[PDB]
């Protein structure tokens, strides 16, 4: 499963 932060941990950006 995937978590609601996979985008944030990949970029370091939000």
């Amino acid at each position, epitope marked *: 499963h995937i*978590g609601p932060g996979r985008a944030f941990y990949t970029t370091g950006e939000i």
Partner: antibody
Amino acid sequence: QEQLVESGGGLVKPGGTLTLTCTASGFSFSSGFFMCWVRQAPGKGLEWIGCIYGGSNDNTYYANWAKGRFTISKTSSTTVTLQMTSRTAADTATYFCARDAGTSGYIAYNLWGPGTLVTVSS
Amino acid sequence: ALVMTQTPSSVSAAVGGTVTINCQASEDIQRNLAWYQQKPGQRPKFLIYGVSNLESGVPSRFKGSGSGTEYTLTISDLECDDAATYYCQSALYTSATDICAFGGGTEVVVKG
């Protein structure tokens, strides 16, 4: 195996300024994780301070109460710094270097050092 | 902001029994919930990420559950090595102050 070791804690007069060092071994500052600082006053609870990104966009992110007194920086490929200015005795605590691995897009502090003790005192 | 609140501040049970800690999140955290065990004198030990994913070496009897607002840690077959303070932790990835918030902690005392 990967390991963190904090460094620089000790006595500090109220208002004096301190710089602590964290040093990683067994892995390197790539991207996909953060290096974070957490403090814990004696007997009190875990209180987050701030993180800093691994990728070269050294994005620094602080807690509400923290910014302006604390600052986190990548001093080398293997060392991260946190610099603080004391005020109150409540700044006396153990300072923990941690790693948010961000595993599967969840928060995951899967690595912690032993912590270093800062004592605000005259 | 985001505040986590662990409800029973302390708790006791016998060896081989079972205890339940709950942690309350301000908003919908969507299962982004990590647990840690800290014995006094030591650094925190990572237990669980994402409400229920056991880190390796963490035995199965640590059952994390929950959804949305209410999450639960359930320690069964309690053993003396479980005597510690347990912390929930979650994150909202929109503001600088919500990258991390720790719960207040729950002490677990084991009766041998």
